[PDB]
From Swiss-Prot, chain B:
It comes from the Eukaryota. Zn(2+) binds at residues 38, 41, 57, 60. Belongs to the TFS-II family. This is Transcription elongation factor A protein 1. The chain holds residues 226 to 301 of 301 of the full protein. A zinc finger (TFIIS-type) spans 34-65. Interacts with EAF2. Associates with UBR5 and forms a transcription regulatory complex made of CDK9, Pol II, UBR5 and TCEA1/TFIIS. Part of TBP-based Pol II pre-initiation complex (PIC), in which Pol II core assembles with general transcription factors and other specific initiation factors including GTF2E1, GTF2E2, GTF2F1, GTF2F2, TCEA1, ERCC2, ERCC3, GTF2H2, GTF2H3, GTF2H4, GTF2H5, GTF2A1, GTF2A2, GTF2B and TBP; this large multi-subunit PIC complex mediates DNA unwinding and targets Pol II core to the transcription start site where the first phosphodiester bond forms. S-II binds to RNA-polymerase II in the absence of transcription.
Curated annotation (Swiss-Prot), chain D:
This is RNA polymerase-associated protein CTR9 homolog. It is found in: Nucleus speckle. It comes from Homo sapiens (Human). Component of the PAF1 complex (PAF1C) which has multiple functions during transcription by RNA polymerase II and is implicated in regulation of development and maintenance of embryonic stem cell pluripotency. PAF1C associates with RNA polymerase II through interaction with POLR2A CTD non-phosphorylated and 'Ser-2'- and 'Ser-5'-phosphorylated forms and is involved in transcriptional elongation, acting both independently and synergistically with TCEA1 and in cooperation with the DSIF complex and HTATSF1. PAF1C is required for transcription of Hox and Wnt target genes. The gene is CTR9. Widely expressed. Component of the PAF1 complex, which consists of CDC73, PAF1, LEO1, CTR9, RTF1 and SKIC8. The PAF1 complex interacts with PHF5A. Interacts with KMT2A/MLL1. Interacts with STAT3. Interacts with SETD5. Interacts with ERCC6. (Microbial infection) The PAF1 complex interacts with Zika virus French Polynesia 10087PF/2013 non-structural protein 5/NS5. The interaction with viral NS5 proteins may reduce the antiviral immune response by inhibiting the recruitment of the PAF1 complex to interferon-stimulated genes, thus preventing their transcription.
Amino acid sequence: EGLIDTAVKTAETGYIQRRLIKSMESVMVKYDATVRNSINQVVQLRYGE
Amino acid sequence: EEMASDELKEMRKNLTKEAIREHQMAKTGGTQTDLFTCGKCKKKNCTYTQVTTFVVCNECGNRWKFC
Amino acid sequence: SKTYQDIQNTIKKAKQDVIEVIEKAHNNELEPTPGNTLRQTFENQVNRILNDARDKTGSSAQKSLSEYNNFKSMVVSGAKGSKINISQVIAVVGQQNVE
Amino acid sequence: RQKLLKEQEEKRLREKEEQKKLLEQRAQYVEKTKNILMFT
Amino acid sequence: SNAHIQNELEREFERMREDREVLRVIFPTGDSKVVLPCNLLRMIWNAQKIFHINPRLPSDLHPIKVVEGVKELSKKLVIVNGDDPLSRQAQENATLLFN
Amino acid sequence: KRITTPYMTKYERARVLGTRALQIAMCAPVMVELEGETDPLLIAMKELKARKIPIIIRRYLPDGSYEDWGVDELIISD
Amino acid sequence: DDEEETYRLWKIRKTIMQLCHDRGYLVTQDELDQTLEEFKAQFGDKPSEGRPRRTDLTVLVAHNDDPTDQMFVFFPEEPKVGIKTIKVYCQRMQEENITRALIVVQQGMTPSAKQSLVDMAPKYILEQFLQQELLINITEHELVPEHVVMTKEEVTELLARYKLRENQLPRIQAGDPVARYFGIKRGQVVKIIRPSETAGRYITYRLVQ
Amino acid sequence: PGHINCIRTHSTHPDDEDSGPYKHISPGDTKVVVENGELIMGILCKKSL
Amino acid sequence: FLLGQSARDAERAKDILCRLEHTTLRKVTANTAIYYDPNPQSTVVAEDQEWVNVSPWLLRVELDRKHMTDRKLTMEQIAEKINAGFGDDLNCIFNDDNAEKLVLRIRIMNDDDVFLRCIESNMLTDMTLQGIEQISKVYMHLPQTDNKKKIIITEDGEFKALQEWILETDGVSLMRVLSEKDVDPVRTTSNDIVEIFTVLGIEAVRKALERELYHVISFDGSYVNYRHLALLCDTMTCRGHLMAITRHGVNRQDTGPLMKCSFEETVDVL
């Protein structure tokens, strides 16, 4: 049971991480001290509020 | 319900009490003790569980663990 | 050699308790616990009894170790291991649950 | 002590402002109940 | 003798009470454990251990010095640069819990 | 009327050090007396410590404007 | 039911009064938090073919600073409101200089009615609210933060401060229950204030679009 | 290195020790106390290292 | 979370639980037998209940007593509902609450043989005697941790967490639950993301998602900085609607064709 659980986790978590990374790959903190994305859309006026 | 006989009223009350009791949920088990001070309420009542020892607050309900 | 006696006594007590629970369930005395059916509450009581017995055996084993013991040193240091590992190695493994 | 007294009287002024708002709202309610009546 | 110091200390306590009310209305359930940049307790301990405070003798530190120092440090730590009223409001809002 | 932070971020510091090291490796004049070393990266680090790197950073803003900051103008982190 | 219907009507009236007070319209402190006893003593407490009948408990309230701007709160009796009812309501509203209003429908209105509602939008603003949605005031919920409708002057000031185009601000559709509660329309920013655990307070903005 | 100051607790630290006496002098050598970057009390474990 | 006095005592909370739990005829009915009794007064079965009250067929739907008492119902409301639900087309002759058997008598007045079968089936499957849909059954468990206990600032100052009754359903309605009396409309969350967006609003959805994520990530004792959670929540609630992290939510954004093909749907987006 434990081995099967580990095998399925090793197969599912990778896809989960991939989807999480491909959705916030362009977000960054610009020099205006604010977090935006590639479309220059402000997501947070300050990183982590 | 009010017009029912004494025996019928008692039976209905017993059934209602049994249903009310059965509707409840079993309390989480654990070893209750006052040796751990909960940081969320300042009280000493709480329950622990060894597995790492998880600490569950009794009154405040502070949840923590000690390794 | 005394911890073995305590562990055997605890295991026998747990076996007697679970047998008594089974007898009560057979003769229709164990009333259903709130929020669960008869089989569910029976299984929950059995599991709680077994877990209490395992914890008692593990605690008895832990309190019967010596400062020179290596398992205890590695567990308290936290480098590699845990108390449950010592409990399974010496006192008793426990329940082999699935799903 | 005098500063405490002037703070107290300022609170009294705010209470009087509440009174004037209440009286104004009533004085418009007397007119608005007529519309509420004629609506039905 | 000086009453200005007394008034300043009273104002400081009033501000402290206001901050306590803000914390209570912002952090329900009384969770003292919070994450902040600078561990002030560790810094105070290091200062004590370096300058050899020896917390038994009467120290030479007037309360007004502490009040003015805190006010100036509350000004130096800026996040939203700009004297604009909106800028100042945002700066106060952001650097609120730390202050 | 510059509003960017007056501190040098790690990214900018690393890029400036690398660029100065590359320039020095390409037979460029140094801006500090050499105490007997040859690694261009070490020379770049020494210049950064001495605040004599002839480079100015252009921090672009989201709107489109930019600000020219000089290495000898803002404070260095490390 | 009789008592339950009266309780629902009282709760709806309280929610409407709270909504009007939130928008800015001046309202009594008494009716803002009036209990149900005076509600019974006022209307009659016999909604089942009695005095407290719909379209009679309507309230007209004027704005705080603009006494010339009002808004009606109708209560059509038809479970499936049609177009004739809203048509006659609009016709009767045309006598006064009023423009805004609020319709309280029993059940979801027919799709044919929404077309007429949006048709008269530039001349007479009117929206709808199902009674099921008025039995609770969402703005008081723990998850819902404290919203503040901003004015154009401060919106422009904000846009100019950060040098950011309004199109870059977050988006919030008009279908949002909060949006309809405050009556905000397209092209209008709303301030948000959430308790920040890492910064005490954090204020963000969202443009309706 | 340096003058570090920190306080940590050992794995086998009895909870009913701080409340009672022997708080600053632990019979079991627990309650790690470091002053001026010098170990004074306690036994090092994962909780501190 | 109960609001009224019911939060303290379980007697006044069981009725709240029952009214929030879906109850149908199947849950209260024990046996259902159809009989082609020609004359109503004939009463092929031995029951002295029709003569006092006064089509050649009827349904004898006898109800259970234990379940009915557990849900605390009365035959008056059952008869009223069964008569109003199907119009003024039948005539349910209920029974007094004094006899031992909880028998009923459903008759139709104005192909006809299967009509009774169809009507009994469609009423037994779903009737909603007392409760709302979706919600199947409701639990009743006391809070053992601070995450659900009530907190009120005492006059002395200390918080003094209080232990109050709380319910745990198995469905998603929210809207029809908050409107019910003796229910705190301020602390009763929903544990669902898409549901809150149609009740409270986008910001409430963001907060709920943040709380759910923190709960599921901190269950194993691990810790993750809140900044990352907040950044994820804002990115999923930036365009107003709940953009899905899958290929169907990120490719809809106006990012750019070269960025959509990287994740998934290469040739489609190109």
